[model samples]
Target: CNEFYLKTWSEWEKNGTPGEQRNIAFNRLKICLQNQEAELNLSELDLKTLPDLPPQITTLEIRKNLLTHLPDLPPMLKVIHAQFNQLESLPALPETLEELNAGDNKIKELPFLPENLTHLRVHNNRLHILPLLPPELKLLVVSGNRLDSIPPFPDKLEGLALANNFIEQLPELPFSMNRAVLMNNNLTTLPESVLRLAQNAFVNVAGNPLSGHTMRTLQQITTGPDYSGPRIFF
Candidate 1:
């Protein structure tokens, strides 16, 4: 049995009532499967730790808890909504996960992400160095952190938000990018790769230290000889 579960069971034994606390200690962690799909909800329980979960569970929600770390997850679990907790580190995630929303925590670093992941939102944390991105990712949001640089992005990404950070330069963006938000950073110039992407993206360049000439140059490039694309909204 888990230490927290044992402690709760011991506390519940004092009253000789084996229902309420047992439900909190064990029943609340139950896994339900129907037609090869499973779901578990343990949200807003003020739990300090989680019990072991079975492998049939696919969707799990433990948001608004008092957890400081994530427990070992099942291999077939796909979605995890664990926001608003006190997590300092995450455990190994299943490779079947596609979406992960662990925002508003105290995380400082990320582990190796699952290969099938597509959407990731971990904003409002204390991260500085992010882990390697999975190739299947499309949407990424890591705002309100201490990042000074970013890792190489995958080519399939479409939405990216790195606002309110310490980055000084921009990275080479993929051509398929459609939306990018880089406001309130330490940027001073835009790279040529961004110029190529600006022809179709909704980019925000405010709150940076770019010179007037640079801004003008970007406008000219957007309307320059190679400007056969859609109207850019810079």
Candidate 2:
């Protein structure tokens, strides 16, 4: 009798649903989300009352909303775009997250990123500091924020894009980065640690006030100047 009741309920639920509409919002595993790249205008949407998502949804785009903070996430979610929200605090991250875009929010501190995270975008926020990042982090973009100090990166980073910030002192980078961009900042001098990182690494320390020949001299060395950035990538 229970099975009959459940079967009847399932039939009723599927009666008005179209076949394509059943998976319009999401699809099977291995396929990315349906609206992964479609520009979503979320200004009028009330995300606090957002419905539960399909289990197969991987990427979420909720930019510019009334959310004071982020809520919990689904299991297979890899990329999240929660920028321009009212988020004063951050929600706990899912271990399966790979890329995060929380720019233009009120977040002051970040959560500890898991090993699967490869890209992070939190520009235009109120973050003064960052949390520890796993060694697998490859791309980071946290410009236009109020960061006084950039965090130490892992040994496996490849690309870094921090164009606008309020950093006063420069920092040494990891030994293995390929591309770096640090434009439009308030740095006065490139520290010895950062100088060593530029020996062979592709570095860009523009927009900061530095001595004319001081940067060239520091780039000749093979190693850093016994200095290191912070342990995390906040």
Candidate 3:
């Protein structure tokens, strides 16, 4: 008979009579949602205060742990893998995030983002400056740290990994860039609108030091550099 009417409605809601207390705010911070899945490992559990998660979480993993601060997220969050930990500052992100991995940790600055983000990994730490971004970002791994400059991009970007640090220049990419990894740092030159993109994008500019009059003015561009992608200056 419908399993005895669901076991008499779970014995009258476990004798409390008025059900719907699903973990009552995650057992008041002790945390535990089980099958409903608001799982918390609290890795290492050496937590230094940061546990009130459960605003209907959607996927959060506090890696390693020793958190410095960060609590107040879960507007239906969608994946945040806080790696290492000892975060310097980060709280206020959830326009229904799509994929954010605060790598390493000790973040320097980054707030006000969530334009339907699509995979952003803050690599290493101590960032130098990066705020206005997320025009529907698509995989940008901020390598190492101490950026020199980076802002303005979002024409449906693909994949860009700024390697090492202290970039010299770069502010014209968005032909739907495929895969670019500016290895090392201090690029000498490379940007004629990136040759208008779509040439099997896969640049590496290995250990940048590109000089020689910027590669002879990019080989005296014979009518606007016709890039074919695959530039790895060793």
Candidate 3: lDDT of 7? 43
Error of 1 at 107 (Å): 0.5
Stretches of candidate 1 off by over 4 Å are 1-28, 31-37, 198-200, 223-234
TM-score of each: 0.81, 0.65, 0.37
Estimate, for each residue in 68-144, the C-alpha lDDT of model 3 and write its tens digit.
78778878888888888879988998888888888788999988888898888898899987887878888888999
Ranking by TM-score: 1, 2, 3
In candidate 2, which residue pairs clash? 130-234, 152-230
- Candidate 1 lDDT tens digits, 95-202: 899989898999998878999899999988899978888998998899898999888889989999998888888778887778888888888787767766745577
lDDT, candidate 2, 17-59, per-residue tens: 3432222222221133243432322342433322333345567
Q: How many Å off is the CA of 55 in candidate 1?
A: 2.6
Highest lDDT among the candidates is held by which one? 1
* Candidate 1, pairs of clashing residues: none
TM-score of structure candidate 3: 0.37
What lDDT would candidate 2 get against the real structure?
0.64
Cα distance off (Å), candidate 3, residue 170: 13
